[PDB]
Amino acid sequence: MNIMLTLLTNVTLASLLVLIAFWLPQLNAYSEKTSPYECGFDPMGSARLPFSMKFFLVAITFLLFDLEIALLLPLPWASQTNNLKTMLTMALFLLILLAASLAYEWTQKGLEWAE
Amino acid sequence: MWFEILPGIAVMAACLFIPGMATAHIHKFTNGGKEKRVAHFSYQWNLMERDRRISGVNRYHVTKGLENID
């Protein structure tokens, strides 16, 4: 309830700042003024054209590695279990395979950006 | 200077003092002056609700000692 009120307050403050920015000053808008900026000149193509990604394989790998974060954040609570030998084996096993997957991608040139 | 940077740092530090001190003072003001209760687990929440029920004024921070058991 307090967090909802906090979020509402922050969003309202930012929205009123935007309203003040757009309604206080004098506006003199024309087409030349509102045209796209490319440092002196009209853009040759569209900015909506495909922009190639050279780190696409690392982006996919980040998705799998981000879920390894999901599996390891319960570790502080897992250290409170009675059978510590089992959890330590499984906690270490999970980090070893993450290290092996990083080693596999590193050796197979997966971390190198496309030329 | 180099000590003319200090007034800006002093203004920044004065501004950054306000949140913590204000939170502490507001907590004391709305909790009978004794450090607003922390309920991380349902047992602490149960203790707070029992305190509120037995206060008689619907406020947990109103504390009843040995003078309430005749």
């Binding site: 279990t81 | 029992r50 029920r53 037995i54």
Partner: protein, 105 residues
């Protein structure tokens, strides 16, 4: 189809997680532990065909604990009759259901 390796080897790969009444951490009970325990003990060893007929009482109680449909219907009926009575003014709610009770620890 089902090659039952676990029981042959006594391995317990996933049976620890199948039911609500099976060895939770810190002995935390399920919301319907007693109902599921009763239904499982009723249906044990007699087969699915016989259990669907002869343990229908236990299973119905377990389902009622799970979803609480009959409880919600009964509460709705009580609330509807109370609202009907209050609108005409025949019935007046007591102080302790209006926030004026004497609380106890």
């Amino acid at each position: 189809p089902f090659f039952d390796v676990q029981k042959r080897l006594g391995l317990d790969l996933d049976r620890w997680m199948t039911i609500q009444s099976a060895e939770q951490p810190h002995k935390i009970p399920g919301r319907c532990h007693a109902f599921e325990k009763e239904w499982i003990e009723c249906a044990h060893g007699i087969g699915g065909i016989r259990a669907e007929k002869e343990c229908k009482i236990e299973f119905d109680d377990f389902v009622e604990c799970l979803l609480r449909q009959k409880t919600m219907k009964r509460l709705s009926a009580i609330k509807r009759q109370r609202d009907k009575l209050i609108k005409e003014g025949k019935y007046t709610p007591p102080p302790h259901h209006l926030g004026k009770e004497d609380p106890r620890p």
